[PDB]
Amino acid sequence: ELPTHYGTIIKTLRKYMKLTQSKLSERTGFSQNTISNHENGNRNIGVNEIEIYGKGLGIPSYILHRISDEFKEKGYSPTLNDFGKFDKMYSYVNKAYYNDGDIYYSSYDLYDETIKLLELLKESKINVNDIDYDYVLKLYKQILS
Amino acid sequence: ELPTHYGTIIKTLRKYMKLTQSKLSERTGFSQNTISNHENGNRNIGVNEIEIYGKGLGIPSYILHRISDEFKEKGYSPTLNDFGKFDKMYSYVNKAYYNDGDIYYSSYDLYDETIKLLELLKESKINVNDIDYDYVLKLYKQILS
Amino acid sequence: ELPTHYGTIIKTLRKYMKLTQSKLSERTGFSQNTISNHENGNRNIGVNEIEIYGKGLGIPSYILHRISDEFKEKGYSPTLNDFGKFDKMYSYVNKAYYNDGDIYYSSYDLYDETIKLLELLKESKINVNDIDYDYVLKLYKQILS
Amino acid sequence: TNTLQVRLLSENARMPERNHKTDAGYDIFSAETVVLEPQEKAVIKTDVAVSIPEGYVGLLTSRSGVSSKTHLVIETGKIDAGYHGNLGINIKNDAIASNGYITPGVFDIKGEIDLSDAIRQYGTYQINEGDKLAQLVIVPIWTPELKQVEEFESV
Amino acid sequence: TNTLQVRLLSENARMPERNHKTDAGYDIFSAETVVLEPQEKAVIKTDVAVSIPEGYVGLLTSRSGVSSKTHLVIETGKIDAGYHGNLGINIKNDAIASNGYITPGVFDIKGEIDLSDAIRQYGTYQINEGDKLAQLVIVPIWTPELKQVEEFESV
Amino acid sequence: TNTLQVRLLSENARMPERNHKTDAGYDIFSAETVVLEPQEKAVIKTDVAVSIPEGYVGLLTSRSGVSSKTHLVIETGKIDAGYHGNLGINIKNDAIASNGYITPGVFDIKGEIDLSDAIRQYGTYQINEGDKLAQLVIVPIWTPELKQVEEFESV
Ligand SMILES: [Mg+2]
Ligand code: NI
Ligand code: NI
Ligand code: NI
């Protein structure tokens, strides 16, 4: 049985992806009652269930566990709070890993690397929306040397 | 052409497994006449034939060659003589190799290791029948450090 | 677009293999007009086209590129000039690589190695036609130590 | 059936991870904290077990970022179908110790240095519980009967 | 469809080569010139890119002549389906530096020595643009869904 | 047909061995006795030959007990379909020689030490005729035609 904060993680994520409890069930195969209990904290959720939510949400399952690890270290998840920024940046990061040798052969963890890139921007008051792939790529190579 | 002592090895093994010359043929596909000649020392046996006897006896073929190597070093096979004890111990040893990391990653040769475990017991006048898996496992890890 | 000397390389090779422009087309699937233009220097040839000529000529494609590299270093190809000798020797060399451990595990480049063996013979005025596999094998091991 | 069964053997175990359905492998995590001075060897426990189906072999192997930016060398383990024990990563620190040079610093799995509790040879790595150390790649296999022959012959 | 798509990324790139239709692999060529003193590491650019199809992995790996007659050690890279960047060869010179011993000589990929422009540690290799350094072997893979279980159970 | 043809090339050759039908590989035996001081390399003869069928590659590779309890490092050889010569195991002793330290002792393939006929560097291994040194794992392969493209494109 996984921690109960997974309920919040799945609700907030479901909402971000613009999906209804009924529409998620249609993709996951859970009962709407089961989903509501999951999110409410009624039913505990298992590791195997987390794999199914990921597929239905169109998010890699391991990311949900990383968010949960943030809950445990602090008491909340900055990543979950600013998930829109994480989405944008994680997509640049993936495009770099699969298309540039300097990234592909040096990278250690794409998630942690996405977060260090966001944290660097925040520290210099730069908005993720006002920059492009090539700017990120140059910076990303800097943090891998 | 393999040495003629293979005839004795196959007879004694056939007998240990409670199989008749006719029943072995039924599983091997040799003629009863061929089997008798093999065991009597009439026909020499080939390496490819040894692979077939192993399958029919339900014993890994390489073990027959190891027994034969004992014949060559001494003039007889202690293992063949006490084959019942070897059977019991070899089974513990295999269960350990496929279920415990300390054995799986350190083991060099399961046959030689089965024999060193028996020889250690003999040197302390301990009967193989009066001990269990967990006792063997502790000892087996000792001989692999 | 590849260099134009590839036209000469394909013509001279076609002729060596005793094939007509029509017969090559039958095996390659090019138009006789295309082949003639290729050889004449009209059409430039692509890398993908070189792969098809190789298959039709029954020669490994990479060899055509090696001949071309000789054209670029000097202004002509000694290998192409004495291609009959290269053929004979390359066949010994391949038989050695696939049948003798000393060659298989030590070899660096079968083409360069074929050429060093010919160059050694030439320097001692020895005719390739008057020697056999075993003589080459002994020499080939010498140049790999 | 296209599923792989996994056992978590302790509270330090992490379920293996994959980015992309098309990726070759599953990333594998250390369950323990290990210090390796130069030329030191260990088999590092993951507290995970898997059931490789018949006809396959599992390959427990290195990651490009780790092997190209550190001296940690991983020897590819071949996991048999039916091995059900704890998966171990077979590792050497192949840095060479430089004369004296001693330090309180230790390198991590990213090639970076921090400060440690003790004095050791310069070049020492410390692996941490939760380090993303290896991957698992599963490939099909051919397992024929052997036949001895005097000369080879056409199939 | 039985074809592999290849991109040549520069004028120093060489199309991969194969002798014999039955050979396991395609020989791969260095696109650059690199000096490696003892214990030195690099990822060496080929200026080639490939598109490994779904269900496979590419193995970028060593050749017997190179690895048995030199100290150059290549760590097998696992190329994912959909990696489309420049292919790199992950290499270490695992010779050990002997005390002093310095030299103007450098060893090549055949184990032979020539004379160089500078003084370096005895044992230094120089890799040249066009060296036939590695091969590419492509094998099929199993990529299942993971299921956690309390105990293993029959398929 | 599910059989692999094998040639025994001498009286020192041993037929390859397998425990369990489901095991990934066949254990392979040294046909000779070899002393390797630290950093010494050799290709060790088995006096065995095999005929790998078309569409496969043979992988001649290490065993966990040997590689984790000794400094003997084996580089995985790729055996082509149609290579019919003597199979060789590509090996280095990757222990480092410690200053002076000389000894009449030699280590074996189990990590143990015995007494030898000569004085050598501490860290020297001796491999014996009949040592169970490597395994053979056979996997299927994809061997396509190459096509050059300006840009990649969907299959
Ligand atoms: Mg080393
Ligand atoms: Ni996403
Ligand atoms: Ni038995
Ligand atoms: Ni030819």
Residue numbers in the entry:
A (entry chain H), B (entry chain H), C (entry chain H): 9 to 153
D (entry chain G), E (entry chain G), F (entry chain G): 2 to 156
Can you quote the paper on this entry?
The Staphylococcus aureus pathogenicity islands (SaPIs) are the prototypical members of the phage-inducible chromosomal island (PICI) family of mobile genetic elements. Stl is a DNA-binding protein that binds to the intergenic promoter region between stl and str (the SaPI transcription rightward regulator), preventing transcription of the str and downstream genes, thus maintaining integration of the island in the host chromosome. The remarkable ability of the SaPIbov1 Stl to target unrelated but functionally similar antirepressor proteins relies on the modularity of this repressor. In this way, SaPIbov1 Stl presents three domains: one corresponds to an HTH N-terminal domain required to recognize and bind the divergent stl-str region present in the SaPI genome; a second (middle) domain responsible for interacting with the trimeric Duts, while the C-terminal part of the protein recognizes the dimeric Duts.
Comparison of the BovI-StlN-ter Dutϕ11 complex with the structures of both proteins alone showed that complex formation induces modest changes, mainly in Stl, indicating that their structural conformations in solution are competent for interaction. BovI-StlN-ter binds primarily to Dutϕ11 through interactions with residues conforming the Dut active centre, precluding the binding of the nucleotide and the consequent motif V positioning. Further examination of the Stl–Dutϕ11 interaction showed that BovI-Stl inserts the helix α8 and the α8–α9 connecting loop (Lα8α9) into the Dutϕ11 active centre, mimicking the interactions mediated by the substrate with catalytic residues on the conserved motifs of trimeric Duts. Thus, Stl residues Y112 and Y113 place at the positions occupied by the nucleotide ribose and pyrimidine ring, respectively, with Y112 interacting with the catalytic residues D81 and Y84 on the conserved motif III. Stl residue Y105 is placed in the position occupied by the dUTP γ-P and residue Y106 is hydrogen bound with the side-chains of Dutϕ11 residues H21 and D24 at the beginning of motif I. In the opposite part of the active centre, Stl residue Y116 in Lα8α9 is inserted between the Dut conserved catalytic motif IV and the phage-specific motif VI, interacting with Dutϕ11 K131 from the former motif and with I110 from the second. Consequently, this short region of Stl occupies the Dut active centre and contacts residues from all the conserved catalytic motifs with the exception of motif V, which remains disordered in the Dutϕ11–Stl complex. In addition, the R74 and D77 residues from Stl helix α5, which connect the HTH and middle domain, are also involved in Stl–Dut recognition, forming a secondary, albeit more modest, area of interaction. In this area of interaction, residues R74 and D77 form salt bridges with Dutϕ11 residues preceding the Dut motif I, E18 and R15, respectively.
